[PDB]
Write a protein that binds this ligand. Structure first.
Ligand SMILES: [Ca+2]
Ligand SMILES: [Ca+2]
Ligand SMILES: [Ca+2]
Ligand SMILES: [Ca+2]
Ligand SMILES: [Ca+2]
Ligand SMILES: [Ca+2]
Ligand SMILES: [Ca+2]
Ligand SMILES: [Ca+2]
Ligand SMILES: [Ca+2]
Ligand SMILES: [Ca+2]
Ligand SMILES: [Ca+2]
Ligand SMILES: [Ca+2]
Ligand SMILES: [Ca+2]
Ligand SMILES: [Ca+2]
Ligand SMILES: [Zn+2]
Ligand SMILES: [Zn+2]
Ligand SMILES: [Zn+2]
Ligand SMILES: [Zn+2]
Ligand SMILES: [Zn+2]
Ligand SMILES: [Zn+2]
Ligand SMILES: [Zn+2]
Lengths: 172, 172, 172, 172, 172, 172
């Protein structure tokens, strides 16, 4: 047992390792999305930039969880980072829809982690999740919903003009 | 023989003179494209500016090759700069397509020059071409592909609105 | 075929995708090493910082290759990022030894890629690898050899004092 | 007919296209002269610089005429830019003599254009030529006469010392 | 075998040691030339300064090769630095001619080294030579050709006035 | 006889040429020592820096003697710069010991030169040696004695920790 460990259940430790993997996976999804928009036959530079920023943010989320693991005296166990489900993300609108689904999945995992921390009477872990993760997710989900709505209302994905203008006026 | 000449094959010297002409020709194509967009019945100022910048860049490419010729002790032999194949370039999209074709042709010539320099065991000439020309071409070709893609997706050439907005938001 | 593709062999395209995965894997190895040194029972903050910097650098290497893939009109195909071979990296000296082995493996892959690019008469790809990757590797390998030498001469891994002082005076 | 065209004779339009070619040709002559002085067996850097500046100026003259063509609703028709009559320009003095002859030829063409514009009662075109071209030519011709005189008085072309010192003290 | 050594042939290692000696020798030649012009019966201060700068540059070339040797895990083996072939360098023009010959000899050695590196499939060493040495030599050779040409055209070595004025106006 | 020569014995002139060679030799010894510490299996960067600084200083000593030779109307005669006696310098302590021996040898030569200048009633040469060389040597010898003492007291060469810490705290 770590000399620092206190009130940290093995189930919590395992759940944190799963969440580290999930955040790394989300980083990889967004990396894949970014460079899709960098293709010469897609060529939406601000979609590419937006998703690349998202990728780096998700990696930061994972690193903060790794720091948390060690702070609490848990032991980090890394797993493979699965390749994303898609190689081709179709359109700006489809990528945004996929991102919205991803962020809702990450939120679900975080809510399950918070329930576990509550069940194990770990108020430090509860606070960590609330403070650093839950409002971040609510904001991310709202932003992506807003993007999806605008792209749909403008006439995406069929209107390449809509995605072009959204790239310039919202993401640029 | 020049007092400076060393390891510089006559075939390389001749190929450099051909490339000087090709870069001057590309400068002239882009000059012609620029002022097409300056016509009162075309009137896309940022297309005009983009192509004029391209023209001056290609002239710089030629001047650097002229400098190289003299650095190696070769002798510059200039040829006529042929007028471009078109007087009227049709549309922004067509001009961009033509530019993409031109840059791919220039790249092909440069790759043939690099093969020649390799066959003649001229590592200085190989390096000169790699350093100053080959990645420049890859970037130019990628940029023009990106432009063509966006113009097509926006609905050019039929949508005069698309070309107008591209002129403002991408080239301006 | 991409509108930008020129002189880019399918074998090169595939090799670039393998190298993207290898650089992502190296990023993950270094991430794992970093947080090992962040453990309360290891507690070498400058080893942690050094490896975290390495991790971010390797991710940048991968992103530049992804950019290259698209520049040349190739298509990025991502694969799983395998978890590193170790969860516990033993000591500062052992981690440095492992890093040296990793960087030599990455270098070997890059040298094989350069041979392939040479065999396929792709001077742009050759130049890209020389310019951005090969001297980076030679420097990384030299730096890690230097670190290993100093740690060994100081009496690591048996001397926890040696690793402490190296952490402060070399990595800090 | 262009929506902007007013009081612009077809003969004037054609003469402007001829003058565009002549200014491009003069740019090319001066380009050729510049790099002659950049040869290792000539090696007069300030002669090279002087002629290169002249080359860029003549290109600017052509671009301003292209702008004029479009301003008046005429249509630009480009022709081949002929290679200069010489590959080797002999000496500083000979190049200056050749430049003086060239500038007098360009002036003659411009005076013929002004006569045409006068005959066609085109005061805007008359003013354009007077304002932007005729005093430019008188100054260029005077400067080149002055240079020729000094080079001759100093003992060029036979005195390589004279051309060396002129390069330093007048052109540098 | 060095822990850093990878893809570095023993022939390459030996050739690098020969090149280190050659660059040190060139440094010594230029040192000797510099102080010749510092003699009271020669007294060309800017020739002295020019050659002294050259001397320090050649020493830097050698130090960078020594660094390269160690970077690749090769072992530096120094040899005697031979005294130059001349004690008295005759005139500014003769020294410049001798320097031109020296730089062409150094270039030949570097081209042979590049051929060896190519034959041994050492792209890092090829790149190192191209990047740091080959264009440096082409520039040095061109500069010295230019100097020789000017000195000859001005009437050196017979005209002590020519060498005096060249010292002031070109080297000063 | 030089027009500047006055009270300068041929024996003094010859002794100055020997001293120029000795200072160049000392520069080469220190160059060799520097890059030994740059080896991946030695890896003491501040030892490397210290010896490289020493090398450049000794070269400056030689250049000042070359200047002196010419000031007095003597004629510089260069000799081969012998390679140092060692390729491998063993340890920081051994290199410092070798440097101390070298500086004492250089001092002995300078004291013999001063005796010669005294015997030849050359007070300018006596002053030159006192002013620029003798206290420089006393300081260099004292500094190297101090270094040797500290390295020995710390437990070098057997303690790689001692040499590591000396490198950081004294030479860094
Ligand atoms: Ca996010
Ligand atoms: Ca999988
Ligand atoms: Ca271009
Ligand atoms: Ca024609
Ligand atoms: Ca690295
Ligand atoms: Ca696995
Ligand atoms: Ca002019
Ligand atoms: Ca013709
Ligand atoms: Ca008027
Ligand atoms: Ca040089
Ligand atoms: Ca000898
Ligand atoms: Ca290269
Ligand atoms: Ca010293
Ligand atoms: Ca010897
Ligand atoms: Zn996240
Ligand atoms: Zn808008
Ligand atoms: Zn070009
Ligand atoms: Zn990497
Ligand atoms: Zn003109
Ligand atoms: Zn050199
Ligand atoms: Zn000394």
């Amino acid at each position: 047992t770590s000399q620092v460990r206190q009130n940290y259940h093995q189930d919590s430790e395992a759940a944190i390792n799963r969440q580290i993997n999930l955040d790394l996976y989300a980083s990889y999804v967004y990396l894949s999305m970014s460079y899709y928009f960098d293709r010469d036959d897609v060529a939406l530079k601000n979609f590419a930039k937006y998703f690349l920023h998202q990728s780096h943010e998700e990696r930061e989320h994972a690193e903060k969880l790794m720091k948390l693991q060690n702070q609490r005296g848990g032991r980090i166990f890394l797993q493979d980072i699965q390749k994303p489900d898609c190689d081709d993300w179709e359109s700006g609108l489809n990528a945004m829809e996929c991102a919205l689904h991803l962020e809702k999945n990450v939120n679900q995992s975080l809510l399950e982690l918070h329930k576990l921390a509550t069940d194990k009477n770990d108020p430090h872990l509860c606070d960590f999740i609330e403070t650093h993760y839950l409002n971040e997710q609510v904001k991310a989900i709202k932003e992506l919903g807003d993007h999806v709505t605008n792209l749909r209302k403008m006439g995406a994905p069929e209107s390449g003009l809509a995605e072009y203008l959204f790239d310039k006026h919202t993401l640029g």
